[PDB]
Curated annotation (Swiss-Prot):
This is Arenicin-1. Disulfide bonds join C3-C20. The chain holds residues 182 to 202 of 202 of the full protein. Transmembrane segments: none annotated. Has antimicrobial activity against the Gram-negative bacteria E.coli and P.mirabilis, the Gram-positive bacterium L.monocytogenes and the yeast C.albicans. It comes from Arenicola marina.
Length: 21
């Protein structure tokens, strides 16, 4: 498994998320 954290904008707000595949 592999998980990477990334940032993204939503409704004008930056949040901290990730992707696990």
């Amino acid at each position: 498994r592999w998980c990477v954290y990334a940032y993204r904008r939503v409704r004008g707000v930056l949040v901290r998320y990730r992707r696990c595949w």
